[PDB]
């Protein structure tokens, strides 16, 4: 059924599973028309499909041409998401296909179940966790590839860089969700924390900076304080 705090370690067992987050699929700017009405302009989006055990991220870039001439775009976006995840599963060798797909928003359940009818053995599940994957577009290299795309494209990343050489999946996912939660709560401050030290760089083949173990401890503490600080600012605490 639903995935929550109680069954949290299941994410890191040896059953292949994917999170699917559709919050960045259909993205718009709202603006005024010459006549003083309101209209939207779409910008490129992405499906965020993540294996939380291995860090493998299947970033399917949704180019604005897929919306041309279509109606009810927020509804279509869910079905397009499900169509693309289905296509990804079919493209994978049998032994790489997931046994479960966890959707971050329950409105994805029916579209994904319907597109996956050919896979009765793949469980489609919701989650009670509030995961910060909407902030994926605050990772500079991901945003860059999405905005530069001129056509539909899939790009593969490891969202954990090389962390699994030194830490467990559980700890890597905790670090990821902390970083993303901080970027979601105060993007500017979080990016300042990550880039303030001129001597620490991001490898060409990585998404995040090359921090030592002790530096990650400092960074993680700074991200926690940012999240708490913003909570106080929000609720006047």
């Amino acid at each position: 059924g639903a995935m929550n705090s109680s069954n949290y370690a299941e994410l890191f067992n040896n059953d292949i599973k994917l999170f699917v987050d559709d919050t960045n699929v259909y993205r718009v700017t709202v603006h005024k028309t010459f006549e003083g009405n309101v209209a939207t302009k779409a910008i490129n989006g992405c499906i965020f499909t993540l294996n939380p055990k291995t860090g493998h991220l299947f970033l399917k870039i949704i180019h604005t041409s897929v919306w041309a001439g279509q109606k009810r775009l927020s509804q279509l976006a869910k079905w397009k998401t499900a169509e693309e995840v289905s296509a990804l599963v079919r493209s994978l060798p049998k032994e790489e296909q997931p046994k479960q797909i966890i959707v971050t928003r329950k409105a994805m359940l029916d579209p994904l179940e319907v597109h996956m009818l050919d896979f009765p053995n793949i469980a489609i599940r919701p989650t009670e966790l509030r995961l910060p994957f909407s902030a994926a577009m605050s990772i500079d290299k991901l945003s860059d590839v999405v905005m530069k795309a001129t056509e539909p494209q899939m790009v593969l990343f490891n969202i954990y860089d090389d962390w699994l050489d030194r830490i467990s999946s559980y700890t890597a996912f905790s670090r990821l969700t902390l970083l993303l939660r901080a970027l979601k709560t105060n993007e500017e401050s979080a990016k300042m924390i990550l880039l303030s030290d001129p001597t620490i760089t991001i490898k060409s083949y990585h998404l995040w900076p090359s921090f030592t173990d002790e530096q990650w401890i400092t960074i993680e503490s700074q991200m926690r304080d940012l999240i708490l600080t913003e909570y106080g600012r929000k609720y006047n605490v």
């Binding site: 029916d110 579209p111 179940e113 319907v114 597109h115 009818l117």
Partner: protein, 300 residues
């Protein structure tokens, strides 16, 4: 006008005949039901006084044989049987009518209720849903499960309604996923009508039979089927006009006949609110919407 003789009434029971019902006391001199209108199916049903558990009954058509009822003290129920000795039958009916030991089917002349509830119900289709080919009549009870219920346990005792499943490969064409799930016209018109039922009369007959089993026996699986067959039409953007108009009439009379105090258990709020207020056909069921809003406004 045909007759169903009873051999006797040895246990206290409430006896239904179609939408009518009456109470028979233990060992009361009751010997059957006369003046049953020819031209329709009928149902004769039972609820014992000492154990209101298990409503059960028999669908029959007096054109297809001479049927009587007798209590079986071993299996503990009133059983329908067929009389193959016509002169025995007629002599038994004549004697019981002369002694005035039969109730009369109490149809008012102006009243088309039963016809309207059974317009599309045929005995031959009932006998395919309820499989017991040695009898010309069909037994149904409160606990019988449907084939669909069984898939999600004795197959011979099952209600073989046509399986309807909105999230199934049968309902969804590869490559038309969103289209077919949000507009069920393909599934209604091509899969169900053209493919399985052959025509709308057979579809409505099964819908009507499902409702009647839900109402008279409290059969939960039948209620599920009734609601599924309504939702399938209402969730289709493209439905022949004659079917929409006929559905409105069918549902109007079903809602009119439903006992008011059974609504909480026989009517699915989600389905009815979706069908009347959100679906493609929300504006096509004027008679049914009016009776629902005047009679069950709470549900909505």
């Amino acid at each position: 006008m045909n007759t169903v003789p009873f051999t006797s009434a040895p246990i206290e029971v409430t006896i239904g005949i179609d939408q009518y019902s009456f109470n028979v006391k233990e060992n009361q001199p009751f010997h059957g039901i006369k003046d049953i209108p020819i031209g329709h199916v009928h149902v004769i049903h039972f609820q014992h006084a000492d154990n209101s558990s298990m409503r059960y009954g028999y669908w029959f058509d007096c054109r297809m044989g001479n049927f009587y009822i007798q209590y079986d003290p071993k299996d503990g129920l009133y059983k329908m049987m067929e009389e193959r000795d016509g002169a025995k039958f007629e002599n038994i009916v004549h004697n019981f009518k002369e002694r005035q030991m039969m109730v009369s089917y109490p149809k008012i002349d102006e009243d088309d209720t039963w016809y309207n509830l059974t317009e599309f119900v045929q005995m031959d289709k009932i006998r395919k849903i309820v499989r017991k080919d040695e009898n010309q009549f069909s037994y149904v009870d409160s606990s019988m499960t449907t084939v669909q219920e069984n898939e999600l346990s004795d197959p011979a005792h099952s209600l073989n309604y046509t399986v309807i499943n909105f999230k199934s490969r049968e309902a969804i064409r590869p490559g038309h996923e969103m289209e077919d799930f949000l507009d069920k016209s393909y599934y209604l018109n091509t899969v169900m009508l053209q493919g399985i039922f052959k025509n709308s009369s057979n579809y409505f007959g099964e819908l009507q039979f499902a409702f009647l089993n839900a109402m008279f026996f409290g059969n939960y699986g039948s209620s599920l089927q009734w609601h599924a067959m309504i939702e399938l039409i209402c969730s289709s953007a493209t439905v022949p006009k004659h079917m929409l108009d006929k559905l409105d009439e069918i549902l109007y009379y079903q809602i009119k006949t439903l006992p008011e105090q059974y609504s909480d258990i026989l009517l699915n709020e989600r389905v009815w609110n979706i069908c009347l207020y959100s679906s493609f056909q929300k504006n096509s069921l004027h008679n049914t919407e009016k009776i629902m809003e005047n009679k069950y406004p709470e549900l909505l």
